[PDB]
């Protein structure tokens, strides 16, 4: 529930620590955590809001110019000086002009001309600094059980670095403890929050500082003072006897293409909502109980109300309607083959299905994991058990291949953190995570300033290099190539 | 034996040490502050070093304040303050390596 | 030369950069540097302001 149709959901099965399971929550999909005798819980990260950001260096992308003026000197005099060069609101430029004996200077060299124009800025854009503190994540979790396809089954958890751990209380189901890592989530110490005109981005530092545009420096208080004041003013000169000042055009469509690989964000009031990150939580399910045990079996009748449907991962959701007034009651349901010997094959994802109301025609939804052959969804007790025919497509080998592809994509997206998704904890997992940290630091230092094409080019180049170098470094090249080219062809 | 609150944050100095400022709500008189740096909240095993004294609150009033500084390990960790079921915790990440 | 009424402006480690209103005046010499800050000084963060 809440994760049935996500198409990017991940199943975290069982626990070997007995109590807790690590998990990395991402904005794209969600995680269904299923223990041995505990209810399946679907956990998703919904929003990350950043609060009270501090302004840094608003740039100016649309300039306007004003009353130009100029000054000039005979070929053998000093240099031209306009009294508006002592004003920090004027852009001024000095050049040499052909002068003499016709213009009113008796000498024939090159005189000095100074032209000044008053600079004003419309439509500054502004960046703000994010600190890993005062950054809040919202986690929504829900429980399986009695909920129909459409409150003791859902919970919302707010997590900030001040309170990184929380407990979601699900009445009658107990409570799920989460200890999470909010600081090291998405690196918000190199990322500014940029706004141009009611459009906000998550932008890297050291891109918001190498921009060639007239920039203020934080606290705009009175008369704004733009520092570069050029990069929007072009000083042309006519045939050695004039000078002209023009402004460059509005620069907002050049920045839109300069941004590429910078995340979009939205803003509510003083807070900025990001819809792309990843949090890491350890889930302590040791106070999670099964509400439904010690219930008598439901024996009246069951009718399929929608149909059995297949999610994108192979599981089967089934919505049933119960006819008898029995009360809180446990639903018999299974997957079977050879309906003479009803031997439970496959696994059922709902931890325990239970009908929780005492009315005539109640509704419930369960989900189950069928085997790969043809099978029968059997729901009922005896002489009134409805059976639906089910057919699952692909053998176990395809499942293992898809699992490796998902793992590779998760590694390419999360970097080293990918080793923490089933991180119950072993020497092998820790060794893999460590050597991946070393190799990731090295790879990000060497490469990582490339963008899907520089990486493809260098990948093909090094691929030829390792293919025909004939030394023992063949393997080093080809492995770096595996890395680069998959980093390209998986995103 | 009372509850602590984080008055500001656990700031990070330039050399990696954390400064934590805590507020005490109980009135037990001069009493030791139970503070540690831990991972795996299940088994609270003290990791890192606390470059502070066996931190103590001096006053005996309703709300008092304390500042202690810690030398945490290079991984992610949790500042654990308090004894049980009231121990506030903060998430803290250190960058360097040995 | 002769010098006159000095003034200064400081900011916390994670803010923008300091800006005096007398930087937009072409009669003042201004210099910008980094200063130790934090908690004691009165701004809560410990970097260089």
């Amino acid at each position: 529930i809440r994760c049935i149709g996500v198409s990017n959901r991940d199943f975290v099965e069982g626990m070997s620590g007995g109590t807790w399971v690590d998990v990395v929550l991402e904005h794209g999909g969600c995680v269904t955590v299923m223990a041995q005798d505990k209810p399946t819980v679907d956990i998703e990260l919904v929003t990350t809001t950043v609060s009270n950001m501090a302004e840094v260096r608003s740039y100016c992308y649309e300039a306007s110019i004003s009353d130009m003026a100029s000054d000039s000197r005979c070929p053998t005099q000093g240099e031209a000086y306009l009294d508006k060069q002592s004003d920090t609101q004027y852009v001024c430029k000095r050049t040499l002009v052909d002068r003499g004996w016709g213009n009113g200077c008796g000498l024939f060299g090159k005189g000095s001309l100074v032209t000044c124009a008053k600079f004003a800025c419309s439509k500054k854009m502004t960046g703000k600094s994010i600190q890993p503190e005062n950054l809040e994540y919202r986690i929504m979790l829900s429980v399986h059980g009695s909920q129909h396809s459409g409150d003791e089954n859902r919970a919302k958890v707010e997590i900030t670095p001040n309170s990184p751990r929380a407990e979601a209380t699900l009445g009658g189901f107990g409570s799920l403890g989460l200890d999470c890592e909010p600081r090291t989530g998405l690196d918000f110490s190199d990322l500014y929050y940029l706004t141009m005109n009611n459009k906000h981005w998550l932008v890297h530092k050291e891109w918001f500082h190498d921009i060639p545009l007239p920039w203020h420096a934080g606290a705009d208080t009175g008369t704004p003072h733009w520092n570069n004041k050029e990069a929007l003013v072009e000083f042309k000169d006519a045939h050695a006897k004039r000078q002209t000042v023009v402004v460059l055009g509005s620069q907002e469509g050049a920045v839109h293409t300069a941004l590429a690989g910078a995340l979009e964000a939205e803003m509510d009031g003083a807070k900025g909502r990001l819809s792309s990150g990843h949090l890491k939580c350890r889930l302590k399910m040791d106070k999670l109980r099964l509400k439904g045990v010690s219930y008598s079996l439901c024996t009246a009748a069951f009718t399929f109300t929608k149909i059995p449907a297949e999610t994108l991962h192979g599981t089967v959701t089934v919505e049933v309607q119960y006819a008898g007034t029995d009360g809180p009651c446990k639903v018999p349901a299974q997957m079977a083959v050879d309906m003479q010997t009803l031997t439970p094959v496959g696994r059922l994802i709902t931890a325990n299905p239970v009908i929780t109301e005492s009315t005539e025609n109640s509704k419930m939804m369960l989900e189950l994991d069928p085997p790969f052959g043809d099978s029968y969804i059997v729901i009922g007790v005896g002489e009134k058990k409805i059976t639906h025919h089910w057919h699952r497509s692909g053998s176990t080998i395809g499942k293992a291949f898809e699992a490796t592809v998902r793992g590779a994509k998760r590694m390419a997206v999360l970097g080293d953190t990918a080793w923490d998704f089933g991180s119950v904890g072993g020497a092998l997992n820790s060794l893999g995570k460590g050597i991946h940290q070393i190799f990731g630091a090295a790879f990000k230092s060497l490469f990582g300033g490339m963008s899907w094409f520089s990486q493809i080019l260098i990948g093909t180049l090094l691929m030829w290099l390792g293919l025909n170098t004939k030394n023992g470094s063949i393997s080093l090249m080809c492995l770096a190539l595996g890395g680069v080219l998959i980093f390209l062809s998986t995103a | 034996t009372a509850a602590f609150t984080f008055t500001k944050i656990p700031a990070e100095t330039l050399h990696g040490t954390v400064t934590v400022e805590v507020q005490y709500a109980g009135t037990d008189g001069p009493c030791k502050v139970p503070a540690q740096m831990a991972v795996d909240m299940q088994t609270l095993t003290p990791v890192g070093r606390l470059i502070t004294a066996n931190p103590v609150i001096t006053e005996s009033t309703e709300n008092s304040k304390m500042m202690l500084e810690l030398d945490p390990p290079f991984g992610d960790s949790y500042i654990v303050i308090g004894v049980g079921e009231k121990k506030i915790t903060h998430h803290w990440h250190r960058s360097g390596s040995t | 030369a002769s010098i006159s009424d000095m003034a200064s402006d400081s900011r916390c480690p994670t803010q923008g950069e300091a800006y005096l209103d007398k930087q937009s005046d072409t009669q003042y010499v201004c210099k910008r540097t980094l200063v130790d800050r934090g908690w004691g000084n009165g701004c809560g963060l410990f970097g260089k302001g």
Partner: antibody
Amino acid sequence: EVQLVESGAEVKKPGASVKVSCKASGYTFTSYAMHWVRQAPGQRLEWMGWINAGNGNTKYSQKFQDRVTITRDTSASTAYMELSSLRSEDTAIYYCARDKVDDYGDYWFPTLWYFDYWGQGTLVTVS
Amino acid sequence: ALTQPASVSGSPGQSITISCTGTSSDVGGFNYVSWFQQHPGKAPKLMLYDVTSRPSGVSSRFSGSKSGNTASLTISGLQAEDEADYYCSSHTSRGTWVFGGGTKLTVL
């Protein structure tokens, strides 16, 4: 303990100049900076400036940059504030407040508890 | 220079809050926020410094908070001897002090 006592109230016609003292007792006068704060009748408080009693540096507010001079007398443990060219707006109460000076002898950053002790006040009436 | 409410009233026994809105140079960026209480006739008395922190001989009822550009003084358990003027002050980034407009609290 710490006691800052100012001179008594004073009445002056416009155009004149007032000089109000602030005698400090109960602490080392040389290691503190004295601020002067003016409060209009039933209005906000106005910070006017400070003087570092150690070396003698002063800093005045922009509103009084060229109307106020603050001096000190260490041997007598006094801080004087002189305001010239009085106006009808200057009818207000003048307080003096201490603040600890850094251990290096400079007063760049103030200590978190700036105005821990104040003076009783002195009414200057501009008629 | 600091935006403070004109007056605030509350019945004895309940909590109340006085806000103080400043800019990114005085209250927004610095923990240099102080609250002074002034009974009529007497000089102001430092009730809170360092935002939350408060002096030695001050009742624990006064609390301080800060969010963005707004500081806030909270008085829980409003007693009798609380009718006075409350002023917020801040040390600006440029090295000057600014005070608040003033709030007259009435315990009724």
